[PDB]
Amino acid sequence: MQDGPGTLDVFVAAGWNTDNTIEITGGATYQLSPYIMVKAGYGWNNSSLNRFEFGGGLQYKVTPDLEPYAWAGATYNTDNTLVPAAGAGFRYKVSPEVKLVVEYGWNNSSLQFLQAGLSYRIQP
Numbered sequence: 001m002q003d004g005p006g007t008l009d010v011f012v013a014a015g016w017n018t019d020n021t022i023e024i025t026g027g028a029t030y031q032l033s034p035y036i037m038v039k040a041g042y043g044w045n046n047s048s049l050n051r052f053e054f055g056g057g058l059q060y061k062v063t064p065d066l067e068p069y070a071w072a073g074a075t076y077n078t079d080n081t082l083v084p085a086a087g088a089g090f091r092y093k094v095s096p097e098v099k100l101v102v103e104y105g106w107n108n109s110s111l112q113f114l115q116a117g118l119s120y121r122i123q124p
Contacts, residue, residue: 003124005029010122013043013101015115021045025053034061039071052076065093069103076079089115097121 012026029039037057044050055073069089074082089103099119106112 005032007123009119011101011117011119013074013115013117015104015113017113023051023113025051026117027053029057029119034059035118039073050078052078059091065091065099067091069101071103094118 007030008029010026011029012024014024016022021044023043025043026040027039029040030038032038033097036049037059039053039055042050042052053075055071058068058070058072060067069091070087071089072086074084076114077090082106083103085107087103087105089101090103092100094100097120100115100116101119102116104112104114
């Protein structure tokens with residue numbers, strides 16, 4: 001036994017908005033427990049400024065790896081600006097060391113963007 005809380009994982013996520021624009025989003029997450037999860041990364045459309053995402057994920061125990069995914073938090077831009085929002089997705093297992101994720105971000109009267117990517121664990 002060694003792989004205890006504080007596990008680090010790498011995952012990428014690239015999506016686009018109805019506005020017809022592509023945005024890249026990647027980073028890492030901290031695994032403290034199977035209950036709540038932490039997510040921190042940054043994304044932008046290659047054009048000055050940036051967008052820092054800060055919040056947590058949500059998972060459930062049903063199968064070796066199959067449960068809905070929920071993320072909540074706000075986007076802190078270098079412009080000392082924050083934009084609270086939320087989204088929902090699903091966590092499906094593909095390969096032994098590869099997992100698929102699909103979630104969309106939305107909040108109040110606004111457009112909804114779709115995101116698709118994968119995740120990979122660095123430690124056991």
